[PDB]
Ligand binder design. Structure first.
Ligand SMILES: Cn1cnc2c(N)ncnc21
Ligand SMILES: Cn1cnc2c(N)ncnc21
Lengths: 350, 18, 350, 18
């Protein structure tokens, strides 16, 4: 086949460019941000995804910088990166070589939705548990994804391993520094962001994870809507009208407005009868108006809903064993070390 | 003007639902 | 209250400006296009919606021109229109005074979706029937809405009358003249448009009406997806891979590509068991790959699914009588006069 | 280039589903 060679720089390395060859090139994605290709490394023969975006060269790329700093089992790994050309002359293009992952949580959920089936609770636990773990890690670096949603959760069919991807909106949130309110994706945008808050924290990702969980249990997005107001009405229909204090926690500029008082809708009636009580409990501790009242990602991992995954005799529906879910490092537990008593079961510590 | 207008819209919608 | 007076020009009139006063002003909508206010006419005391958009004055407004030409019982009426100012100095703003309508098909469908209920078949018929009638009318003028979706279908709670609104994307399609492919709304975009066709016809609105119908029967959008490709995959999962001929009908530039052959999914399995056979039949005649094979809006009105509405003893769940659904004019039947034999029942002709 | 690339993406997705 047509072999392409370039001098790429390793992702997690001392910045030492090297020759890299690849073939079997084919477009597998295209957006306003750029085109995404699939390729096979001539060396290892492994499949990779090449995300090509337009770079000004005069400004550093935030995504690249964030990625080159990440190294976790639940985060898409950045193999190499390099510059080139392609669309419209006299312009530099940044190419991100990431590991290729077959499916996404979104596509799997879709299969079940049109199959009139509910995703087995076992998978909901496996996926949510890994999502929170990736969140505990990026947050430990003070990094906020700002775009958590099913489409950005890559999955390995066989291993059932989940990897967070798409860091094109990620940013390091410095306590005491403004930030754009119109961030994240529609259905998954925290209430504070819909109210135009500018001093939000990483807790907006936990809200997004809660919407994800709820969607997996419901079979469809829990808070649909075209505009922010629509979104907020969907949220209020479930959580009820927020109190003045909750409103103050989200955006004090709305404290004195007198919103109609709508009664909250019981989480039990929201989901189906056969919904695990622990799932509902976990959901209510994630989808909280007050951002500081939401569970931390590390705390969510310790929640009872994930007890089954801590069972020594747990197995995947396909017979295989569950991915490594207890290899927590010091950096991962930094936020709350004591939790290691629960996060790491006895049959793993020794 | 932003809050005032956003609030008005939200109030209008909520009054319809409730 | 604070009374505002202006010299507005009547919508369906000989262009004779007059004084108009109104109060009870309040924002009820805001978008990238402009702000929408609600007001009460000092004269009749009737409620109206004022859509204010930015106008260059150097270019005629397509929406205004299209609206001033429309006059139907199933189309939002344009009361008056005038110019003024508001946001950012030295700029002219066009204000559209339209009749105010309380709800939308989207909001009603939403109520049922979170109530775990299915919208009563009677309403599905009433709404779909009126939607097609508004389509038969605008199409008779060679006008294509290009943005049919639940949110643009206004409803009167009591009368159950439906009015099509939002003509900001409407355009007169001249046979043999290019047009933007990225038109309509996501979930409701015809296949030809997703394939980037530029010579599409008004039949794209009929596809959108079919997605609307399917959503009302399903309880959720039938073809979800973030991008076009995602949309197309959802469509293919239901209708099956399109044949070369169907592909040629949509966009000949894709004739020779060899797409994997996926088996169609039976419409019976798509909806729930208790779904009226006539609804499913109507749906399959609307959601057709070949745009020329789709039923015309006037033909859809004659479909058997709407027989119940032609029953002399038909009534609304609230006891009231059904809106005027047989007052078809010559202009409305122009497309296919003979159909008047079915469209207008015996207990109405005389 | 547009058709070719769009087609490639669609083919890639369909092969996964089927
Ligand atoms: C769109 N897109 C971005 N990253 C990836 C990946 N790692 N695998 C498959 N697709 C991707
Ligand atoms: C947003 N919007 C546009 N037109 C209308 C209308 N007639 N009634 C209520 N809302 C509207």
């Amino acid at each position: 086949s047509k072999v392409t060679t370039v001098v790429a720089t390793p992702g997690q390395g001392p910045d030492r460019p090297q020759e890299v060859s690849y073939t079997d090139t084919k477009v597998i994605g295209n957006g306003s941000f750029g085109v995404v290709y699939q390729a096979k490394l001539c060396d290892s023969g492994e499949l990779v995804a090449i995300k090509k975006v337009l770079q000004g060269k005069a400004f550093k790329n935030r995504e690249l910088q964030i990625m080159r700093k990440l190294d976790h089992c639940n985060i898409v790994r950045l193999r190499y990166f390099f510059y080139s050309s392609g669309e419209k002359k006299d312009e530099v293009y940044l190419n991100l070589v990431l590991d290729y992952v077959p499916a996404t949580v979104y596509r799997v959920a879709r299969h079940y939705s049109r199959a009139k089936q509910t995703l087995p609770v076992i998978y909901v636990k496996l996926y949510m548990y890994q999502l929170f773990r990736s969140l505990a890690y990026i947050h430990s670096f003070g990094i906020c994804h700002r775009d958590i949603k099913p489409q950005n959760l890559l999955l390995d069919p066989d291993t059932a391993v989940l990897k967070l991807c798409d860091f094109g909106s990620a940013k390091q949130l410095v306590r005491g520094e403004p930030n754009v309110s119109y961030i994240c994706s529609r259905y998954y945008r925290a209430p504070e962001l819909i109210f135009g808050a500018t001093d939000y924290t990483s807790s907006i990702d936990v809200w997004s994870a809660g919407c994800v969980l709820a969607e997996l249990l419901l079979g469809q997005p829990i808070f649909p809507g075209d505009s922010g107001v629509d979104q907020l009405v969907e949220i209020i229909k479930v959580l009820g009208t927020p109190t003045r204090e909750q409103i103050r926690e989200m955006n004090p500029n709305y404290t004195e407005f007198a919103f109609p008082q709508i009664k909250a809708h019981p989480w039990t009636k929201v989901f189906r009868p056969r919904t695990p009580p622990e799932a509902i409990a976990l959901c209510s501790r994630l989808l909280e108006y007050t951002p500081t009242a939401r569970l931390t990602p590390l705390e969510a991992c310790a929640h009872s809903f994930f007890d089954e995954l801590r069972d020594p005799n747990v197995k995947l529906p396909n017979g295989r064993d569950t991915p490594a879910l207890f290899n927590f490092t010091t950096q991962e537990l930094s936020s709350n070390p004591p939790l290691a008593t629960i996060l790491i079961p006895p049959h793993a510590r020794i | 003007v932003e809050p005032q207008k956003f609030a008005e819209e939200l109030i209008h919608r909520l009054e319809a639902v409730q």
